Design a protein around this nucleic acid. Structure first.
Ligand SMILES: [Zn+2]
Lengths: 121, 208, 73, 83, 125, 155
RNA sequence: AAAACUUUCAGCAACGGAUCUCUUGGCUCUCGCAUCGAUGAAGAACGCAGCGAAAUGCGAUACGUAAUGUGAAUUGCAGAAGAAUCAUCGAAUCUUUGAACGCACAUUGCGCCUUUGGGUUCUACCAAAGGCAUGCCUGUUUGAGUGUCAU
RNA sequence: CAGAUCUUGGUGGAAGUAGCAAAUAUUCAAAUGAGAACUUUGAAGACUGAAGUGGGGAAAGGUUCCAUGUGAACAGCAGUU
RNA sequence: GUAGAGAUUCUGACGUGCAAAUCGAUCUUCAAAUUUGGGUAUAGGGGCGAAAGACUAAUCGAACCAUCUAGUAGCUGGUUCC
RNA sequence: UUUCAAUGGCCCGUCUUGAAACACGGACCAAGGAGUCUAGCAUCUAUGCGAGUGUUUGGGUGAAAAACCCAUCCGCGAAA
RNA sequence: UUGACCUCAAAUCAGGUAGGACUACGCGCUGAACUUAAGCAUAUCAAUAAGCGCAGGAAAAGAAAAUAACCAUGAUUCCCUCAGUAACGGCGAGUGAAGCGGGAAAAGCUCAAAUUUGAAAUCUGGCAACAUUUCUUUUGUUGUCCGAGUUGUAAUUUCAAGAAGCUGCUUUGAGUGUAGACGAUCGGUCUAAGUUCCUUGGAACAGGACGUCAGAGAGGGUGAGAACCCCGUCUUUGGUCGAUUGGAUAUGCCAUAUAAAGCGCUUUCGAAGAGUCGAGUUGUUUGGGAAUGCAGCUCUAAAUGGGUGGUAAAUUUCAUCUAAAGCUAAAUAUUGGCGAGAGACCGAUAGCGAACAAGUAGAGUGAUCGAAAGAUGAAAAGAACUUUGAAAAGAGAGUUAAAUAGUACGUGAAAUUGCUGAAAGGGAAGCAUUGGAAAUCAGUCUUAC
């Protein structure tokens, strides 16, 4: 079985040959299944399918991380790379601009804050 | 309560007269067993029940506080009569005295073994054995409803200060442990019947 | 409760104690206080005189607190 | 007041499959779905048809996104990879 | 008595949880007690059953029968034990399933994860 | 159609009232919720009392003017007499009622001695620890959560 | 008038599915929580497994991939050998649609823009990728006016 | 609960009864088969008689097409079709 | 006069039908105010009507669907053990 | 228990002055199937207290939708 | 002629935003009828259903153009009470509030109208730098250009005041680490004791002996009633180790008070929201009655002016409040969604329509309509084999504790049906009463003294 960690520590072009070889192997296995194949071949069909899925996952994550590195510290970045929590969360006021205050309120909070007090018995 | 729309979710009007049928509402449409069948009636299958039960029925009921206190005092007085304890079903034929009062050192019991020990020297363990032997499967639909087992009531331990007595005694089957400041008639007169066997602590008895 | 009531003693008796000649009909005499001058007048006059018409003058925005005056002997 | 011999002339659809709700309720000549109101932006919906609402309301389908959102809410909408 | 309110005493809920338990949860639901020698050697009362373990049947018509666990058949809550079989009419042999609570483990198939499990459950090895 | 003894019926039940029946099965639940919220507030707000001091006022009618109840806040005139500025009164837990007024010296004095008792028994922590400014206490080791009613009840 | 027949009673056997027992369901109450969508939602359509119709799950990475946790299964057969129809879940995939957005649509219908690539075939044809809705807001750019003037 | 032309489901007498009578009509041999008035082949007798009971299409249906296989069930007799 | 479109009579057949309107005979029309397919328009106190209160999916002196609605009941029926 | 003989015995339910009715409903069996709950009122009865009475709007207290306890109001009653 | 500006356009211009779904509870609009009044038209139903628009985790309301007439209260919301009361009503049926008082919860504030005028002190965007992160996904900072803005962006002020002045005390960061402590927090983990004998059984989880544990005798599972067989339960508001958060604390660094602020007195001054208030009128609403609110139309203020004081008018006093601009937590709601715990609930014609492949099969052009249906056994051990038959099957045998459990499967009622035995019968049957016949059967007795 193809394991993701040595899949990740290779290059994109090398993984391209592995992906194409796996696709050809799946095509051969499907031809074997329709011409009459054993359970061993039919089990290799699902194994090859998952190996293709693992490789395609590795290509996509390498591509996305490269896009993240290229767009790091950029004011505008691709939408799919931005946050997706909820539509409302993205539309809400940020904590910075929720906490913005006038100089009138800054003076009031500076000079007369809520005091820590206690009462004697 | 039942669903307030249970039995009315269908659409069905009376077909009327002239069809050799009872004038009840009947389900329209076709291609199904339900079509042409009855609806909207207590006599009808899948209909509404007569006078469906409501949530705003009176479940809780008021008693005058003075009459609640009357009953609590009467139940405590009943617990002080040996004849009522025997009649209600308590195996107190061997206990030393009524009311059975134990020292405040009992409040500091930390182990169930100590509690079952004390019960054996005060000869209160016959009541516990009675409770254990009376454990049965509940008869009827109760056990389908988190009412799986039934058993008798054992001694009622009443304490003043808690430093372990509750945890030491609570696993003994049938034994109930209550503070003297908050005595309950549900536990002083189980089943509405007077004369429960009560084991008092010295401080609890003094605070009575 | 329910077990010490009627309809546990009329189980078996036809008409459920409302009679055969007249039966238990929905509102044979009208709903609520309907009447009082037309067909309920006999009950209304002999058991509730003074029910119809106005007596006295109206007070708008009556407030009880300025009128509060309990009396002790 | 003609039954048989009149049902034999019925071979002309008045409704076809709707592209939005998938039901055979798309009036051709009106170009409107009797079920969901397509092509209107809103969905045909009426409070007298309470049973009609529950036949197609939220939860009768997959809710694949809403299931993902609920899982993400339970853990606080965090992003990144665990260390 | 139970005093927590995060745990349920409902028969409906407890039966649903047991019979709807996934494979990982059924792994713990299928636990067997250790023999006296294993209990005094590992300071463990019970471990979940694993394939390849050695057990002895303690209850039922097969009481006293011994054999290696060939398959812990989780979806029926059954253990299939080698040579614990039944002769069908046609001449073939069908396995007889034994619940994990009705067997006693007399030898464990020790792995480094099983050793970690033993020492994690207040034991030693 | 009304033939029995008793008073004439008056049941206002000709609308759809079952739609709006309100039950109280959550009364014990709400009581516990209010208890938990009150205890959460008690632990969160530090030594500060859970209830602010309130003035002693008289209800406005002949039916109730012989009694004394709790008001909303102390008037600006009362705060000036007690020597507390309106800017600091809200910070140290003294409510301010800009709408009320002292039409009598009796009401003025009543609430002034209330503020004086509160000020005498109040421990104000320094804003920065170890640097007592004006009004700040020098020792705050004995600070406790006490009840304003016990310290200063409505008489 | 004996048998048949009819009726009654009982036994056995049928027909039927009452009753009793059960119950991963319903109903009601309480407690707690606040989270959909143009970054494509709710819904719909068609597909996806070695052997599947549905349900359940998923989207051409198609009864799932990554990551984390557990630790040796799955199971009807076959079958192989960090397993698993396991749990969790912060990374991804997410077909045709749908507010649905190039125009349409009882037509896998009809267009346009940019880039790239293909081959016995190269001004041809084809393929792939990325785009082209409306209203409004800030700004930019290009403007129009016998609108107001300066010059 | 004996009633409500009650509700749902089940089952009777009628009763082996009404009935299976429009569209001219079938018959012989052989084959197959456990089983043939009905299947198939041959022979005969007939009919639709070109505005057809022929050969095609549109609307509608949707796999009914085709070969192979056949315990039932369905083809209101039968059935190897 | 045929096809086709109709539907006068037998008040025939049938009338738990082959048929919730059919069959037989007889009959009316048969080159135009003709017959008809598909497309399209008109929708319920509305449409459409060479006009019968005809027709508008076997529903028409106000279609069908769902709700208000468990509408109302001086009226009929039933209303369970000793 | 079955059957026989003697005597007696109309089909039940229903509205009705009057039903065996040539008045209505009922072919049969099993299961389901109709004076309920709520806000009031009135008589009566039981209990507690009594010129008072009503803890449960709340607060306290219980790890517990129960029970226990509790300030100030307020309802009704003490005057028409 | 070039320019400036205004107005109005275009772009697949740069960057954003809106719809749809949901709708239990929120705010509005629109808006009935059945019903009741024993008819019915005002009324009632009902400011409801249906329809339409727009939100949130709550919404709305909210810091008095509020009450009251007091010794005065003091934003809003909700609860109790006020109160079935004042009042409205063919004064019929009916409808019907508020102030007070007690409680739950409490929190206050922001602009417009001011000359910064010795200095647009204000802000979006482009660019480039750094920094920061629930996060390469987030959020800022500094510099520099372009613009916006004098047809007004900051600072200062909000009537409770304030503003300018007059000395004089008092007060002061929108900061950043780092360290450890103290709390909270989803979660990975951790957890006491018989499976000893006998009997019954197919199975011991039963019965009986003998024990053990218990802060654990809740509840399930396991071949029948299991605290000790298994999962759990109690300990647990906890040990644990892995990340999270909170308010303090230790100091580190950055911070121009050259500032700002509260307070105190002014012989002073004090800007305060218009087709809006108000009035008439017409609708519609309300308990609001000589209009309660809202809306349409007409007329349209004012400056100690304008509201309001629940009988219209003029007049004169008195209180109170300060509209025509704005924000705001908590207490309150929640037939929906999500996660839990329950129950004197139902028990397969019941409970949701649906315990099951259920909004499914099926119906209808369509809107819509909408079922039936749970149970072999501990285990399929699902009947090998022989024999009869074309087969389906039967008969043996076999499995089982049981086939009086064979999938047409737990139990298996009645209607109704066949067989057997008995009996009866000349155009009904059933019943009651009394005895005969035939079948059937118990008591009593036998003994005790
Ligand atoms: Zn549609």
């Amino acid at each position: 079985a193809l394991k993701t960690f040595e899949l990740r520590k290779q290059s994109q072009e090398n993984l391209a040959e592995q992906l194409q070889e796996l696709r050809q192997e799946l095509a051969s296995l499907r031809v074997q299944k329709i011409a009459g194949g054993s359970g061993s071949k039919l089990s290799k069909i699902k194994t090859t399918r998952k190996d293709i899925a693992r490789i395609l996952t590795v290509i996509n994550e390498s591509n996305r991380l490269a896009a993240r590195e290229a767009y790091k510290n950029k004011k505008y970045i691709p939408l799919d790379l931005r946050q997706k929590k909820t539509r409302a969360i993205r539309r809400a006021l940020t904590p910075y601009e929720q906490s913005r205050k006038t100089l009138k309120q800054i003076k009031k909070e500076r000079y007369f804050p809520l005091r820590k007090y206690a009462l004697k018995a | 309560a039942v669903s307030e729309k249970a039995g009315h979710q269908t659409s069905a009007e009376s077909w009327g007269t002239g069809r050799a049928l009872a004038r009840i509402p009947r389900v329209g449409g076709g291609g199904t067993h339900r079509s042409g069948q009855a609806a909207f009636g207590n006599m009808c299958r899948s209909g509404r029940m007569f006078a469906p039960t409501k949530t705003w029925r009176k479940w809780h009921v008021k008693v005058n506080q003075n009459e609640k206190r009357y009953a609590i005092a009467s139940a405590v007085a009943a617990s002080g009569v040996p004849s009522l304890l025997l009649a209600r079903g308590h195996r107190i034929e061997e206990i030393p005295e009524v009311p059975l009062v134990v020292d405040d050192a009992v409040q500091s019991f930390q182990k169930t073994k100590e509690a079952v020990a004390l019960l054996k020297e005060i000869k209160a363990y016959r009541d516990v054995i009675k409770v254990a032997n009376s454990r049965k499967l509940r008869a009827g639909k109760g056990k389908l409803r988190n009412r799986r087992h039934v058993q008798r009531r054992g001694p009622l331990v009443v304490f003043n200060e808690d430093t372990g007595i509750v945890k030491a005694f609570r696993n003994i089957p049938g034994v109930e442990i209550v503070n003297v400041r908050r005595l309950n008639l549900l536990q002083l007169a189980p089943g509405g019947h007077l004369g429960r066997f009560v084991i008092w602590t010295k401080s609890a008895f003094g605070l009575l | 409760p329910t077990h010490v009531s009627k309809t546990r003693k009329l189980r078996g008796h036809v008409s459920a104690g409302h009679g055969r000649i007249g039966k238990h009909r929905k509102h044979p005499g009208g709903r609520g206080k309907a009447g009082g001058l037309q067909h309920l007048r006999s009950h209304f006059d002999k058991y509730h005189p003074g029910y119809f018409g106005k007596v006295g003058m109206r007070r708008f925005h009556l407030m009880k607190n300025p009128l509060w005056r309990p009396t002790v002997n | 007041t003609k039954g048989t011999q009149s049902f034999g002339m019925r071979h002309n659809k008045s409704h076809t499959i709707c592209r939005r709700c998938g039901k055979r309720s798309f009036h051709i000549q009106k170009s409107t779905c009797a079920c969901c109101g397509y092509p209107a932006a809103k969905t045909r919906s009426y409070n007298w048809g309470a049973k009609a609402k529950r036949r197609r309301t939220t939860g009768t389908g997959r809710m694949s996104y809403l299931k993902k959102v609920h899982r993400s809410f339970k853990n606080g909408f965090r992003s990144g990879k665990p260390a | 008595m139970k005093f927590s309110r995060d745990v349920t005493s409902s028969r409906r809920k407890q039966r649903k949880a047991h019979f709807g338990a996934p494979s990982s949860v059924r792994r713990v639901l299928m636990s067997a007690p250790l023999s006296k020698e294993l209990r005094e050697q590992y300071k463990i009362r019970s471990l979940p059953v694993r394939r390849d373990d050695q057990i002895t049947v303690i209850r039922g018509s097969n009481k006293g029968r011994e054999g290696k666990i060939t398959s812990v058949y989780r979806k029926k809550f059954l253990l299939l034990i080698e040579r614990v079989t039944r002769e069908k009419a046609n001449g073939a042999s069908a396995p007889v399933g034994i619940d994990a609570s009705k067997v006693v483990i007399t030898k464990l198939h020790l792995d480094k994860d099983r050793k970690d499990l033993i020492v994690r459950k207040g034991g030693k090895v | 159609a009304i033939h029995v003894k008793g008073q004439l019926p008056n049941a206002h039940f000709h609308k759809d009232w079952q739609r709006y029946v309100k039950t109280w099965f959550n009364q014990p639940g709400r009581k516990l919720r209010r208890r938990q919220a009150r205890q959460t507030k008690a632990a969160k707000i530090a030594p500060r009392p859970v209830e602010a001091i309130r003035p002693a006022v008289k209800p406005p009618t002949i039916r109730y003017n012989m009694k004394v109840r709790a008001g909303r806040g102390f008037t600006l005139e009362e705060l000036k007499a007690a020597g507390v500025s309106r800017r600091v009164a809200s910070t140290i837990g003294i409510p301010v009622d800009h709408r009320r007024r002292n039409r009598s010296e009796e009401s003025l004095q009543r609430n002034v001695e209330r503020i004086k008792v509160y000020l005498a028994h109040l421990i104000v922590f320094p804003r920065k620890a170890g640097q007592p400014k004006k009004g700040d206490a020098t020792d705050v080791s004995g600070a406790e959560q006490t009840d304003v009613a016990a310290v200063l009840p409505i008489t």
